[PDB]
Design a protein around this nucleic acid. Structure first.
Lengths: 284, 287, 287
DNA sequence: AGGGACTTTCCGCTGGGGACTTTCC
DNA sequence: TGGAAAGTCCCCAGCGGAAAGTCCC
């Protein structure tokens, strides 16, 4: 009965499975924000849980709560609470209740549905560390502890007064926001010059090169006044996290007799840009 | 008996009495949280501390100066609810100090003695930042923490006259910002007007890039094929001429005066202790 | 053409004159659109129709009694722009009437004849809801249509004194809701025995109005002129004695305990989440 | 202490469900 | 007119970003 307690997902001819695991990440929401929705599956759908081996005809109650991911044996995560998702499109009916300091949702597992359930009313609230730590008793730390597991459990009543209690966890779920863009960083370039017609393909080696990354060639005066800007073409295909394939643009002045020294940088999004790289254009 | 509300308005001068702020504190002062230790006492631009003094005091008795953090907002002065003075003790802490709570305002009390001219140097006073989460929860305070990060150093003293009357002088410093600035932006060099020069150095070099702050420095290096930096000289920057995109630098002299072959060295720009640009290239020429 | 601008605030008396509303209109009168027939005339809850009168007129010249529909907001009186008086004619219509138009406002005018003691039963008036889209597409307006669906019957009779001056009384009626919508949802306070009490509260108040479900709730709030609802406290609403028409509220305790000057605050009934009465008035007294 | 690294709060955008309004019976 | 149904437009869950607050290294 108590939340934190060793339980297997299967006993005798009874087995509780996560037929459909949730996504790896799921930014949780604060009480001061709206809701950020329910935990979804990679497919775009939702997780699914099921109880195999049931003979009876009386529906059961599937219990849901946010637990820990760390090594230690499963226990309610003191910094997260399942958030009950209501209507709008929610299909599984759900009841909400507290258990100690843990909120717990409970949807029905009706046999008319092979004791299968589509968890799509489960969201993830995030308590404020300060609020919890300060609690007299808790000796845990919220700081940097932002992973969880959807814990599902069903209690199977036996016509023998006995009760078989099964429990099941989802794969770990990361619940913190993750920056949309990383800072690009060019460490090496297989080209440092080339004729003004450009054309050739240059390969950059660095970090955080997403497929959206872009490359810009510029040239400015000692003043700082930019007197030339040209975006360079990238070989999306070959492009990888650590390597970049670009097509050195044509320089602005076809006919030059002196080598021209220009600049270029990779950029992710509207801000995250690496730093000025050097290149040179040689006379025809 | 000297208990007059901190919300009570008092003035800097009364008759033959005036409490001026001799040495105002710095515009900014990073305040510390309780989870942190302390981050010093407030300091004056001098590099030392702020100074308070009571002028027009003929008597020869030891008075008690009071200190606390006030609100530097569009309303009337009053104790800031998210900030408290912080008592600093020990070593270089010259002036002595006494701490005490009033309402929810921690008040510091230093001594104002005649032997020193009813003058004092503030150096046992720091600014602790209370948590927005804690304060707002208090059944009462209707104020917000969100962006309220300006404070003021209020000083007040209760003078007891023979006439039985107790004059009360109060005075608040100028505004002090209590939120650490913005960490450093990565300097970026896109161009330089010089690529080499005689080992005697001494010439001025102009760099063109972004994120250069007068608080920027330029460092020259040189390593072996192994990467062993076998040299490291800091070049002088022309603080005046320099700007966001233009950094003026004085090429430092080379280590080995007499060489026969050209030496290829490097140099980088740096903001703060960390944020530094990537190595740039430069060459010193034999005499 | 002695029509004096409708915006000019005017007392309901000027000397021994007194323009009163003998009988008051119902709390509600669903108005009709120009795509519907007419939903009839305004009536008194007594069953009959609203009654107006003028006291202090010894003369014999039967005077006219203008009538237009006005706003029922916090602001000063002003001609409502999403409502027009509808001139109703017929058999049972005892009183005659003349319909004119002052600018974008349609005005009605019946006779206030002396041979009736300067009385007048208003059984010939209706209210026409205008489409919000059309009044909001007017070059010169700034008021919102949506939700703004409360109005008041406005009267004002011109009187010529033998001294050259033209007096002018005006006496609008209670507020009237014109939408079957809110008429059925929104709760309306119409009576409150207590206007004020001391800052601690406790004192129990009785409200008499309409649409008071067991789910009703009262809420005291206070806001700065800037509209900053700073305080909001829900008063315990006696679920017992309360009835479809009466509520017993335990006046909550005011937020500031040591207040000096009376603080005026607002309170309101509210069912569900949207269904809420109109801002009521109360004033807390210091101790 | 100087500088960041992780946690909260707060701003904006968008689509389909209501809240209201206006047309019908 | 009393009762709605059809029509319109506001509003907020859900998210994605990112600035302000806290507090480690």
């Amino acid at each position: 009965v108590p939340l934190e307690w060793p339980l297997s997902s299967q006993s005798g001819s009874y087995e509780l499975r996560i037929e459909v695991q949730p996504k790896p990440h799921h930014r949780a929401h604060y009480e001061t924000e709206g809701s950020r929705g329910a935990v979804k599956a990679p497919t775009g759908g939702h997780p699914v849980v099921q109880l195999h081996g049931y003979m009876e005809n009386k529906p059961l109650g599937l219990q849901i709560f946010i637990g820990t991911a760390d090594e230690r044996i499963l226990k309610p995560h003191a910094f997260y609470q399942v958030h009950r998702i209501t209507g709008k499109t929610v299909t599984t009916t759900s009841y909400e209740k507290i258990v100690g300091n843990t909120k717990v949702l409970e949807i029905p597992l009706e046999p008319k549905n092979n004791m299968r359930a589509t968890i799509d009313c489960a969201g993830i609230l995030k308590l404020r560390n300060a609020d919890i730590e300060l609690r007299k008793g808790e000796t845990d730390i919220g700081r940097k502890n932002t992973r969880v597991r959807l814990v599902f459990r069903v209690h199977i009543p036996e016509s023998s007064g006995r009760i078989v209690s099964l429990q099941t966890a989802s794969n770990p779920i990361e619940c913190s926001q993750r920056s949309a863009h990383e800072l690009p960083m060019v460490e090496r370039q297989d080209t440092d010059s080339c004729l003004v017609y450009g054309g050739q393909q240059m390969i950059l080696t660095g970090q955080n090169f997403t497929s959206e990354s872009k490359v810009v060639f510029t040239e400015k005066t000692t003043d700082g006044q930019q007197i030339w800007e040209m975006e360079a073409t990238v070989d999306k295909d070959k492009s990888q996290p650590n390597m970049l394939f670009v097509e050195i643009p044509e320089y602005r002045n076809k006919h030059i007799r002196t080598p021209v020294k220009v600049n270029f940088y990779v950029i992710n999004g509207k801000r995250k840009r690496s730093q000025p790289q050097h290149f040179t254009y040689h006379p025809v």
